[PDB]
Chain length 404, copies 2
Amino acid sequence: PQFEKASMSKGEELFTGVVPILVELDGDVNGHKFSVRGEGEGDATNGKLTLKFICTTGKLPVPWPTLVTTLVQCFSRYPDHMKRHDFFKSAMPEGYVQERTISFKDDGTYKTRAEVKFEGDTLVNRIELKGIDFKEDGNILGHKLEYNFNSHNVYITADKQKNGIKANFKIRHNVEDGSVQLADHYQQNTPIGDGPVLLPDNHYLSTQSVLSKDPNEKRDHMVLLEFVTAAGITHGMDELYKYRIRENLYFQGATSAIDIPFPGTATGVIDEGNVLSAVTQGSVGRSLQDLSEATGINVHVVTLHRLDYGETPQSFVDDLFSQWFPDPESQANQVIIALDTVTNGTAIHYGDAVAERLNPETAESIVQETMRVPLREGNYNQAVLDTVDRLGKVLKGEPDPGPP
Amino acid sequence: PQFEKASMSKGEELFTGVVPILVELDGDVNGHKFSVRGEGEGDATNGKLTLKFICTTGKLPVPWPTLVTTLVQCFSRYPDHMKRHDFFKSAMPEGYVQERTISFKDDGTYKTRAEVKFEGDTLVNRIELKGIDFKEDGNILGHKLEYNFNSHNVYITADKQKNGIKANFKIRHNVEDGSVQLADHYQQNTPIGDGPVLLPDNHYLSTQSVLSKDPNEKRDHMVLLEFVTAAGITHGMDELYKYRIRENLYFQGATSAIDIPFPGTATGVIDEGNVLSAVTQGSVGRSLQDLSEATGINVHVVTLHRLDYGETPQSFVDDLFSQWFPDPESQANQVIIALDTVTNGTAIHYGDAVAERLNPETAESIVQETMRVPLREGNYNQAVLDTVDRLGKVLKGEPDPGPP
């Protein structure tokens, strides 16, 4: 079996071999202050990672395993069929901001902000950690955690408004008395630069960590080794799918036009890519209804997650319109605007009655300029409202306003 | 997110913690004879594995990395949503026979047979290896391979006839001159005992190996550490799906009745679970056609991979018959027999005209005894032919023969 061997981003090629790694952390938990420095290497092709951390201020005031997740997901092994979903490498060399909240069950919580970026040939992770309201003799400050680490799944989803991702997972820390201490993780990454990045389908990383000690070393330290790979889960893999309906977990795949059936409505908005607020849809709804009752032109606005490979925005919107409005009579009385929320590609289609009021060069200007300019900052709500505002005045037969 | 935490086989519960491990290998390559013994532990919940191998006969005549794949896939981490596909643990404690052929590109080939089974509380892998026609100064016998190891995917499929699995993968061995030496792997596993086992959907294991040396050790040896997890890939995850049609790679999922459209044929066989030879289908074809032309009863035989969760063999065959033959007139002139090839569950449905010749207690005997008895040994061809033979004589109006 052979898959897409080609490079999917420029950043991906920086990790082609072994990349040196540096980690720096300034922490404060309940006021006990500390610092950690770490160095090692990473081999992203194989998903291998090797680091040695040391506490530069004495002995760690918290247990080492509690800092593992804080102390470079760009070194994950994305198999060939998953390469299009590797956000982390696509943000390089500029890097990303990785922020987290870590709630230890029945105990305090960490608050973390790091920058992960290339400085020369080395990948650098620079962290600030703050820990609040921990129990004086709890599992954390009391150092009751075992020096070992379990494997986990990190569930990832795209944050399209921020041109980044979000992730959630539960870390299980073995307690020396046989119990288990839970650390719920909420995470957000956002690229430092303005270059383009890969916005992923829902997927997960399966993680493994092996903690050890350096016999020669006498400072307080941790030796860590890791393997990491990405994978996806679709609804058909989940025996429990039928029952957990009463999201952000399943690999969406591409949207083909047939996947969107005609809504059965004169006008409206179809937010399949889930980028629009209910308040926005309510406003767009009233506007398109205004246009209909006055001009008798019916518009639908369709968002979607991403398009099939090989199919373009124009080709999707052309197919959809044929499917919705088979009869040429059902045509012309109808419009459709489409938006790919992963790529921000847009396109329109309309029947001749509309073109009896809408010129090509204008119609392009409305989807390629008025609509796309706000997507430059991830403002999908404004992109749709502006487009609705400009087009509606055209179809009401008014002075066309300008593009941005 | 929460998935099926429950146990899917009895064998699965033997790996609940850390299991001690023992490996024994007797090898002969081009006549250079050797033995290796290894001991360590495995933690299948986390997909971790730790072993130390030593050559008991001097220095290894071949490079250590070339024996990694030969020297316990039961220690793989199956995530919760994949537990139904873990063949390896379900064959325990009796175990399985793991046989392989390893073709080193432009060089010789290994031939291997092992038994993996529990002896007391320890998992034991006992291997015989034979190597044939290697190059005297090749990459193998010449010891030109680097002491390191890449990550790989092991692609797995069910071998239903043998109540086991098959797997294929390509191992890439780094060569000290910068080139890469390929070792194509063909594999077959079969349970040692007669107890029930899990037959899996297509899936893969993503593997990682870290090779190291023991400083205190002076014998020829290898220290190995491993992480391993299972995952699946459906067609929608593969950008190249549309082009590689002109198999055994994609996670099949369950078959619902709607997935099988009415074939458009008076009679025939539909081998959706892909267990029947063309020669068998040709024979069944002529028989069912004989029954039709003579008695005017039309039979279809349908196999399928496995059923949706919650749906039974009877419930699938009842739905299918309604879907194929809506009109009660299209009924009675028609029969349908269904077979789940993963579970060997069977069921029939027929219209009243058939029951004007076919008694319930008999119809059951034909699908629950005549058809299932040959499935006990994985003989799907004989199961269908026997059932066709017995039923056809009933519907021709002849002395019913017996069940097994």
